[PDB]
Amino acid sequence: EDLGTGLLEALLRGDLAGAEALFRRGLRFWGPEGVLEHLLLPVLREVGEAWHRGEIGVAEEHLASTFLRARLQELLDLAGFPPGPPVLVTTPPGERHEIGAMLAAYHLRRKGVPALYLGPDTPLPDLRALARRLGAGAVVLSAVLSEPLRALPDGALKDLAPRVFLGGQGAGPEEARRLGAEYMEDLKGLAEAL
């Protein structure tokens, strides 16, 4: 697992070419899904750990996250966008971590589901209005922090779309039930739940 360390080290020195080359190598080794699990995700977690310990600053994290977000968006577009009633994917209001939402939309598209990624931080009434107008079959929410969920009143997610899914590190079964959403433990079960 040299690639994880090397990719991080390449990004931290502002070597985009080297970072890109290391990521492509991961894609070659593990394929699209594999490179997320073994490279993109571990690096994102380590970046958070390094910042938390004071080993790197915010600007370093920004650089790494922006790079990896660009790579995931590539895979997202590579997965394609099929016809039919879309599934809207975003994060609850106040939640600015968006890569979990992108990841969810990615796994849905891989299964032929037209997951529309909106970006993060969408007000619930606006989310519901879009879902209604596009005739969206479902809404998917990624919660990394728990406070944006705790800030919501009971039943807040209930009427967003015919089906409403909630997951992420910030989400739990008890909280999803309170908000009126279906809890999904992992991305594996999310794709099959539809």
Ligand X SMILES: C[C@H]1O[C@@H](n2cnc3c(N)ncnc32)[C@H](O)[C@@H]1O
Annotated binding-site positions for cob(II)alamin? 37, 45, 48-49, 52, 61, 65, 94-99, 142, 146, 168-169
Binding string, residues 81-120; x marks residues near ligand X by CB under 6 A: ------------x---------------------------
Q: Which two tokens stand for residue 162?
A: 């015919």
Nearer to ligand X, 46 or 182 (CB): 46
Q: Least CB distance from residue 172 to a copy of itself, whole Å?
A: 25
The answer to whether the CB of 164 falls within 8 A of the CB of 182 is yes
The answer to the question of residue 183 lying near ligand X (CB under 6 A) is no
Nearer to ligand X, 121 or 175 (CB): 121
Is residue 162 helix, strand or coil?
Answer: coil
52-71 residues in contact with ligand B12 (CB under 6 A) are: 52, 61, 65, 69
To which residue do tokens 């032929």 refer? 112
Q: Least CB distance from residue 158 to ligand B12, whole Å?
A: 16
The answer to whether the CB of 140 falls within 8 A of the CB of 105 is yes
The answer to the question of residue 46 lying near ligand X (CB under 6 A) is no
Among ligand X, a copy of itself, ligand B12, none, partner that 118 touches (CB below 5 to 8 angstroms by kind):
a copy of itself
What's the number of CA atoms in the CB half-sphere (13 Å) around residue 35? 19
The answer to whether the CB of 141 falls within 8 A of the CB of 161 is no
Provide the pairing of β-strand 138-142 with 163-167: parallel
